[PDB]
Amino acid sequence: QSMSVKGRIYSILKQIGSGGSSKVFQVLNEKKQIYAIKYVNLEEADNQTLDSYRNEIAYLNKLQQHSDKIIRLYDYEITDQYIYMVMECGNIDLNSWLKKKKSIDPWERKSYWKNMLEAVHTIHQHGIVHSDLKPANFLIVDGMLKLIDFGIANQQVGTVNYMPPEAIKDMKISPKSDVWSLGCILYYMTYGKTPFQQIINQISKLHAIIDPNHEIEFPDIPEKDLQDVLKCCLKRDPKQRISIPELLAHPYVQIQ
Numbered sequence: 001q002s003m004s005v006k007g008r009i010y011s012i013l014k015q016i017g018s019g020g021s022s023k024v025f026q027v028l029n030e031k032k033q034i035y036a037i038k039y040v041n042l043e044e045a046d047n048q049t050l051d052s053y054r055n056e057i058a059y060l061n062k063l064q065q066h067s068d069k070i071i072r073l074y075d076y077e078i079t080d081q082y083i084y085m086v087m088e089c090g091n092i093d094l095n096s097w098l099k100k101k102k103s104i105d106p107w108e109r110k111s112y113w114k115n116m117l118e119a120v121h122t123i124h125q126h127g128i129v130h131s132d133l134k135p136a137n138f139l140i141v142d143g144m145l146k147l148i149d150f151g152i153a154n155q156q157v158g159t160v161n162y163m164p165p166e167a168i169k170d171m172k173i174s175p176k177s178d179v180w181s182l183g184c185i186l187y188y189m190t191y192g193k194t195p196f197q198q199i200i201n202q203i204s205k206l207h208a209i210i211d212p213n214h215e216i217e218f219p220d221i222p223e224k225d226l227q228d229v230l231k232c233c234l235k236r237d238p239k240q241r242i243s244i245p246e247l248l249a250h251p252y253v254q255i256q
């Protein structure tokens with residue numbers, strides 16, 4: 001069927017995403033251009049939730065100017081009952097793309113890493129720490145990764161494999177928390193698994209993540225600089241962990 005957003009009509013092609021009280025659709029407009037529309041049902045949303053949604057939308061809209069590695073938001077319509085967000089349509093998200101992948105071109109890997117650093121660096125410059133980065137948060141669009149969201153709105157889901165030690169100990173969050181998560185993503189793109197994927201029991205997995213006696217294996221590989229990045233991102237002490245500005249000057253992303 002169909003949808004109107006700010007007095008413009010969009011034909012639905014198919015659903016491509018879901019999240020409790022939200023759906024994402026591939027759609028075509030009047031000019032037969034393709035877009036993604038994110039729909040959010042507001043019926044059962046408390047005031048804090050509603051405010052978390054408005055806040056994420058405002059940052060997405062603002063950070064449009066600041067980096068092309070953040071997904072495009074062209075328009076939106078917001079009422080008491082719903083939100084419609086007209087966004088860039090991507091080819092596919094990074095989690096799905098990696099899951100149907102035997103191995104990765106080192107060049108493609110390096111190029112995706114750069115994109116991830118750029119996007120996350122950008123949000124950090126505006127005071128935002130995402131704190132739940134996973135491959136699902138990145139969208140492949142025209143051979144590029146774009147960050148889809150900022151971790152601000154309330155709510156594969158609840159996965160613990162990318163969660164840094166300091167997030168587990170809380171019961172503090174800094175930009176370094178996102179570096180760990182990014183490091184888990186790159187480690188996955190390098191070795192085909194997250195660093196604690198072996199441990200099936202979640203409580204053991206949590207205990208391994210915070211245990212400095214538990215050594216994370218970094219098997220040798222051709223690219224020594226890649227191995228070094230992974231070691232530097234996956235320091236349990238956030239004050240010992242490499243920062244994003246430092247990762248952008250690392251030989252892994254700069255050399256050749």
Ligand SMILES: CCc1cccc(CC)c1NC(=O)c1ccn2c1CCc1cnc(Nc3ccc(N4CCN(C)CC4)cc3OC)nc1-2
Pocket residue numbers: 016017018019022023024026036038087088089090091092093096136137139148149155
């Ligand atoms: C993790 C981020 C997040 C946080 C909170 C709420 C949502 C909404 C569920 C979301 N997810 C999103 O907003 C999503 C999920 C997918 N997309 C978005 C935002 C806009 C968007 C734009 N293009 C796409 N392209 C796209 C992604 C995956 C696929 N898939 C390929 C087919 N396969 C079976 C898996 C899904 C196909 C696509 O386009 C054809 N996806 C999204």
Ligand code: NA
Pocket residue numbers: 056149150151152153154155
């Ligand atoms: Na979010």
